[PDB]
Amino acid sequence: AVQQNRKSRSRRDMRRSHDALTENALTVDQATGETHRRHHVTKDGFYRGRQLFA
Template sequence: MAVPKHKISKSKRGMRRAHQSLLLNNMLLINKRTGEKNLYHHISTDGFYRGKNILYKVTQNNN
């Protein structure tokens, strides 16, 4: 089992964790169609990815 040799101060622990909050903010983008925030490389809630409809096929009515 891994055991630390020395106590990690609150400052050092905080410095190590500082990047965790920064990563999520940098990975968000604003969807141009809906204005919602999405993660990169993920499909938006309306089924679009990189401007293309992925989830739902567009059908044409020939009436």
């Protein structure tokens, strides 16, 4: 099965109208003052006032 007519650019864009990306949930960490992904350990190993790597 295959199309009988080529799809127009308008219809192609209409199909793509649902393809937009979204933003992640980012928050400032109180212990360090750095931006981090909410509920995740920071890239330096801090979470909820605890430190993972000495």
